[PDB]
Design a protein around this ligand. Structure first.
Ligand code: OYR
Length: 437
């Protein structure tokens, strides 16, 4: 395979379904490189746990934690890291209300080169234990020799785009990492970076971030096909924001419109949204506690019951992970019979305006509240017109490993979306327990 897309290891599936999965301990192993320094971008951290995932010989190498916590939460994180003198922290600025630092990324500097890991897991034990999570592993990027002048740039512009993403933090610890990236050759990179950063973007900057970034890439580097209106859009996520009083206010206006872009030429496109039902969660490996990582509040949901008609159950027989609740987020464009896809995105971005951006000022400005990061797989970046869907995830190799089942299955009439702050007391979970928030 050329895609280097992995799932995390799941405790409690047959070994067949972890062959070619990665634990965090595998990613940080000396076999991946001799670590000199690392940066861990994430949302939440168990620092004691995190240090123990590094090889013992690497545990005193510098670590930078990039987070968005403020006030007492920030103090709690500093207290966590205080026993480790090699740990530094970078507080990502969140100057728009209700924003989050969701981006999950490792920068791994080695004696041998540099690696970038863009993934979906928090740095806590539960996120790597029994959840479905996604990982993109960059190649080992070699250092550009001193005195050599070359860009180190890929046909997907990944090196400049990652530097641009880091530049938006305006942080001195991240300028150091930008200078590291400058000295390495990233030209083998075959994915496109799609980031979100907080701000209000107008003019050309509108295309830099969020769903306008996706739209720009699809217009520039994908082609439309006959019957394109028959190719569905699939979105798959672990958290749901307030989308408005009906589908026209954001979901099916600007968001779907960016998602259905293909090529430069100018809607009945089916939209499938995949989000765990209550029954998905109850019968999962973790039981109801899996719902602690599926944040959808009743206050949000009761204002948009229209949305739940779009919802499809989580099912992942293809990867043996139907009972491993998803914390991965993915978006893709399958063919009408789901046998091919026009592109695939793995990201931190949930189904929210905060993550993807909402148009403001008469459609001229894109406002984004949060930091998000994902990578986009486009057939053109691999010399292809489309990707064939891998029928069994772990089983040619121009075949893309979609980690859950197609077509997605609509909720039944008795199903309900998982809502994390209401009780479930009708039927016990796989550990014998109810859910009482
Ligand atoms: O599904 C996603 O992807 C996603 C969705 C939301 C999100 N964070 C978020 C939350 C929120 C999320 C999770 C919790 C659970 C407690 O903490 C987890 C934790 C903490 C510590 C430890 C620990 C530490 C040391 C040792 C051992 N253990 C372990 C686990 C609590 C809260 N509540 C919000 C609310 C908003 C919001 C609010 C108002 C308006 C608009 C938005 C936004 C984000 N919110 C993070 C993720 C993610 O994974 O990045």
């Amino acid at each position: 395979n050329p895609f280097q897309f992995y799932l995390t290891r799941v405790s409690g599936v047959k070994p067949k379904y972890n062959s070619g999965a990665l634990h965090i301990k595998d990613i940080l192993s000396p076999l991946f490189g001799t670590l000199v320094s690392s940066a861990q971008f994430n949302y939440c951290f168990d620092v004691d746990w995190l240090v123990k995932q590094y090889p013992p010989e690497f545990r005193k190498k510098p670590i930078l934690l990039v987070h968005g916590d403020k006030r007492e939460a920030k103090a709690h994180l500093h207290a966590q890291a205080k026993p480790y003198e090699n740990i530094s922290l970078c507080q990502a600025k969140l100057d728009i209300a209700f924003g989050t630092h969701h981006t999950k990324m490792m920068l791994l500097l080695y004696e041998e080169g540099l690696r970038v890991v863009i993934h979906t897991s928090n740095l806590i034990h539960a996120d790597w234990h029994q959840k479905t999570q996604g990982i993109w592993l960059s190649p080992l990027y070699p250092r550009i020799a001193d005195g050599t002048h070359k860009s180190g740039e890929s046909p997907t512009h990944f090196k400049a785009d990652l530097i641009s993403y880091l530049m938006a933090y305006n942080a001195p610890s991240l300028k150091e990492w930008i200078d590291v990236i400058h000295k390495h050759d990233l030209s083998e990179t075959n994915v496109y970076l799609i980031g979100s950063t907080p701000g209000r973007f107008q003019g050309s900057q509108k295309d830099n971030w969020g769903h306008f970034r996706l739209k720009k890439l699809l217009k520039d580097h994908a082609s439309s096909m006959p019957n394109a209106e028959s190719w569905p859009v699939v979105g798959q996520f672990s958290s749901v924001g307030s989308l408005g009083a009906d589908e026209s206010k954001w979901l099916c206006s600007e968001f779907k419109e960016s998602m259905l872009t293909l090529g430069k030429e100018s809607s009945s496109v089916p939209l499938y949204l995949i989000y765990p039902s209550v029954e998905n969660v109850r019968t999962s490996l973790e039981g109801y506690p899996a719902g602690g990582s599926l944040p959808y509040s009743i206050q949000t949901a009761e204002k948009q019951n229209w949305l739940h008609s779009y919802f499809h159950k989580w099912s992942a027989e293809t990867s043996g992970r139907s009972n491993a609740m998803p914390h991965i987020k993915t978006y893709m464009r399958p063919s009408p019979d789901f046998s091919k896809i026009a592109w695939f995105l793995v990201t931190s971005a949930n189904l929210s305006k905060a993550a993807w951006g909402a148009l403001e000022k008469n459609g001229t400005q894109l406002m984004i509240r949060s930091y998000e990061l994902g990578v986009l797989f486009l057939p053109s970046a691999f010399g292809l017109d489309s990707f064939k869907v891998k029928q069994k995830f772990f089983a040619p190799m121009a075949t893309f490993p979609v980690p859950y089942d197609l077509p997605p299955e609509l909720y039944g009439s008795k199903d309900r979306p998982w809502i994390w702050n209401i009780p479930y007391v009708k039927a016990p979970d796989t550990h014998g327990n109810m859910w009482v928030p």
